[PDB]
Short mmCIF file of C-alpha atoms and ligand atoms in Angstrom, two decimals:
data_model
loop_
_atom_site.label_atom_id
_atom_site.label_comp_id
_atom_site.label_asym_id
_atom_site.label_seq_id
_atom_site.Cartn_x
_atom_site.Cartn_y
_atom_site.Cartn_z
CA UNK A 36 -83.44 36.16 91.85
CA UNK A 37 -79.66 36.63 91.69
CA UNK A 38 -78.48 33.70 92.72
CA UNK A 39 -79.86 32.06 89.96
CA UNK A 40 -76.95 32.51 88.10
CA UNK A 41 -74.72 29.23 87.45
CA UNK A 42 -75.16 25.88 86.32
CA UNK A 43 -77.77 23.27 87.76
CA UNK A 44 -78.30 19.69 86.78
CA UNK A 45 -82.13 17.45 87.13
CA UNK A 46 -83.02 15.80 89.89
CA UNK A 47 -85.99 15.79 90.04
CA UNK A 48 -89.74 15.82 87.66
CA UNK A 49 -93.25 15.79 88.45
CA UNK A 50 -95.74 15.79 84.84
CA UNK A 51 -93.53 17.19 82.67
CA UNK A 52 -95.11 14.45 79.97
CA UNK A 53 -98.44 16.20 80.47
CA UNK A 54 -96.91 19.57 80.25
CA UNK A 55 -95.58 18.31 77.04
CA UNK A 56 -98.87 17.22 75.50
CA UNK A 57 -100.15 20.14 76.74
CA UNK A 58 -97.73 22.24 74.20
CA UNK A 59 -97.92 19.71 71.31
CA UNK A 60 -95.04 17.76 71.53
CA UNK A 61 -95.08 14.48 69.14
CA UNK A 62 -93.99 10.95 70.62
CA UNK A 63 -90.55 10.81 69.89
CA UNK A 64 -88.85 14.19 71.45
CA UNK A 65 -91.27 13.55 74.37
CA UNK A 66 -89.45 10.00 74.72
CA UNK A 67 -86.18 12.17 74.55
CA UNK A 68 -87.32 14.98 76.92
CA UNK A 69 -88.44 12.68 79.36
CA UNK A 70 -85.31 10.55 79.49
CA UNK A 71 -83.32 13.71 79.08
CA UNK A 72 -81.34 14.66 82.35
CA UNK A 73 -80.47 18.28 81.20
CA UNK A 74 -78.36 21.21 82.81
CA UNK A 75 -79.03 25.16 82.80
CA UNK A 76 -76.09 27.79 82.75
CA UNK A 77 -77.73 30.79 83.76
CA UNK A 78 -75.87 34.11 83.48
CA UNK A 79 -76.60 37.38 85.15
CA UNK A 80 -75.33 40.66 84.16
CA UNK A 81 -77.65 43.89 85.80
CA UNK A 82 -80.73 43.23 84.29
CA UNK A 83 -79.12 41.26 80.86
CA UNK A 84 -79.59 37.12 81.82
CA UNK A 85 -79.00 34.03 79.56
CA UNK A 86 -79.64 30.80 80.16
CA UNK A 87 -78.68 27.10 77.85
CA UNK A 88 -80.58 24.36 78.30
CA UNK A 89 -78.62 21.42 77.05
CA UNK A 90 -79.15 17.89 76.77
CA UNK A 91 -77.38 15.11 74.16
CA UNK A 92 -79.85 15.97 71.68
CA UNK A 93 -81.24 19.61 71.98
CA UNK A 94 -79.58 22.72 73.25
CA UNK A 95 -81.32 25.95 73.54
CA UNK A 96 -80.20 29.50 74.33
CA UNK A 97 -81.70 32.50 74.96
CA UNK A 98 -80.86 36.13 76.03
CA UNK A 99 -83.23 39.15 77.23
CA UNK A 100 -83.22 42.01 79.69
CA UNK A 101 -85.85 42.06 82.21
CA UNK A 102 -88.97 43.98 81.87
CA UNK A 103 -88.26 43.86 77.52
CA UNK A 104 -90.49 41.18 75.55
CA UNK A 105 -88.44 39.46 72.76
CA UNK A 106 -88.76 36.34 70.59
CA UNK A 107 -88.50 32.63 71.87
CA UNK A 108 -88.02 29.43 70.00
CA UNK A 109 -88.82 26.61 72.23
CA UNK A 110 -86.58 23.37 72.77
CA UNK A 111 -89.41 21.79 70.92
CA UNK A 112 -89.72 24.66 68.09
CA UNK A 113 -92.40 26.51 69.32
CA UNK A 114 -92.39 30.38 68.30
CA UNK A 115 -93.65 32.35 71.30
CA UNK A 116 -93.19 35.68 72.75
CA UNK A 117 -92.13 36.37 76.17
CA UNK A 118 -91.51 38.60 78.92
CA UNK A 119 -88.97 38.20 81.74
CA UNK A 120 -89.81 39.87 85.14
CA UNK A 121 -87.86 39.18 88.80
CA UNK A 122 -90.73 38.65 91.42
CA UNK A 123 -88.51 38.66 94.65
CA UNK A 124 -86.70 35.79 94.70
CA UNK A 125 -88.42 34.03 91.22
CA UNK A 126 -87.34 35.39 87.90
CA UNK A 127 -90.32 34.63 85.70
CA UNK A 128 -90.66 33.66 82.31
CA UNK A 129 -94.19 34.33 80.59
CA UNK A 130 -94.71 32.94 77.20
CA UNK A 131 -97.20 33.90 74.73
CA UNK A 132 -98.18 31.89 71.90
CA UNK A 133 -100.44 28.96 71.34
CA UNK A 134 -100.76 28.15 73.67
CA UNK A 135 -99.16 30.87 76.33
CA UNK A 136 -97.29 29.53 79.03
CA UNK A 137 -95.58 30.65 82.93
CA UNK A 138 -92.30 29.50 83.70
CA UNK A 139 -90.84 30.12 87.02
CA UNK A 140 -87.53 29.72 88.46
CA UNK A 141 -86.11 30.40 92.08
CA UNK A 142 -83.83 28.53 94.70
CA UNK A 143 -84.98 27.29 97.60
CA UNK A 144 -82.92 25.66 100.07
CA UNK A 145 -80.01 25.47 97.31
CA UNK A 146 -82.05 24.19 94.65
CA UNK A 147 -83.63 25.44 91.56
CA UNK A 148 -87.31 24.85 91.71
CA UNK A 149 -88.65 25.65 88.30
CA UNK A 150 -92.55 25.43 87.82
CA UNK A 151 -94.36 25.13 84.16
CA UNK A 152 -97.66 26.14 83.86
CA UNK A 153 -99.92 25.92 80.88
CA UNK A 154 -103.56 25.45 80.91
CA UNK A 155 -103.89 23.58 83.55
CA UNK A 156 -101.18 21.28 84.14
CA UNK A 157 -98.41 22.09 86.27
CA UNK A 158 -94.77 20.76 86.19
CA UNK A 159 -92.70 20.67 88.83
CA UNK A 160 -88.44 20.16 88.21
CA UNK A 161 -85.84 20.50 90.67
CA UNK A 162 -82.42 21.17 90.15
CA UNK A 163 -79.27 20.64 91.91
CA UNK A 164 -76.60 23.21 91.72
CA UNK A 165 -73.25 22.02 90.02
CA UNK A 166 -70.65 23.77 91.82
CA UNK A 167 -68.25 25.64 89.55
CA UNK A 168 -64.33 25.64 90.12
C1 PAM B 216 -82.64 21.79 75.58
C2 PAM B 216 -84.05 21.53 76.07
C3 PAM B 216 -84.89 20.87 75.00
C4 PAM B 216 -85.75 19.77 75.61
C5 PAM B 216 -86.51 19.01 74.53
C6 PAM B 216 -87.65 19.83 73.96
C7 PAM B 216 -88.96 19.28 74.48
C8 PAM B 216 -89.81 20.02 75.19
C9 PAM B 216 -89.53 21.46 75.53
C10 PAM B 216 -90.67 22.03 76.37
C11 PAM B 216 -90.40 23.48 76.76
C12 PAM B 216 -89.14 23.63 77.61
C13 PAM B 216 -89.13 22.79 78.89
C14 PAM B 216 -87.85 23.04 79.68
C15 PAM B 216 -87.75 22.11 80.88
C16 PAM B 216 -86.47 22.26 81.68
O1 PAM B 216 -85.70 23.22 81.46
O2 PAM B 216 -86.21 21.39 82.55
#
């Protein structure tokens, strides 16, 4: 899951509105989300990441070494719990809360494919990498 690290842009969605009702989010951020074209810096350093989603209204941050559960506010302000783990090429992000929640990212043919999962909707969004210097 290495080459995860740097910074990637949307290109593509498939139900991330249902993925959002799914978790509760109210009208008006889902308007935002959904209109939202946002990047991810991902850092890796051993088994220490970080990663900043940001868009022109919302930017979140988190930090965590793999394998170590730690505490997760959501772009949307959900308090969860999660776990990191690498899975070959995916690093995977599992969520616990209400309700839980799998993220998964890992490149494919140069892109970041990241897949949500909760309940049972799935969200597909693909990410172009943004070449740095
Ligand atoms: C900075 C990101 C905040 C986006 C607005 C918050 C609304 C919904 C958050 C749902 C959980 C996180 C989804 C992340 C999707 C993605 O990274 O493309």
């Amino acid at each position: 899951a290495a080459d995860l690290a740097g910074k990637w842009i949307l290109e593509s969605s498939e139900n991330f509105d249902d993925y959002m009702k799914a978790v509760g989010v109210g009208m008006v951020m889902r308007k935002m989300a959904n209109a939202a074209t946002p990047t991810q810096e991902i850092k890796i350093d051993g088994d220490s990441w970080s990663i900043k989603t940001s868009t022109t209204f919302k930017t979140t941050d988190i930090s965590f070494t793999i394998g170590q559960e730690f505490d997760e506010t959501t772009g949307d302000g959900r308090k969860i719990k999660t776990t990191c783990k690498i899975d070959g090429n995916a690093m995977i992000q599992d969520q616990k809360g209400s309700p839980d929640s799998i993220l998964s990212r890992e490149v494919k043919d140069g892109k970041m494919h990241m897949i949500l999962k909760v309940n049972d909707v799935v969200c597909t969004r693909i990410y172009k990498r943004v070449d740095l210097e």
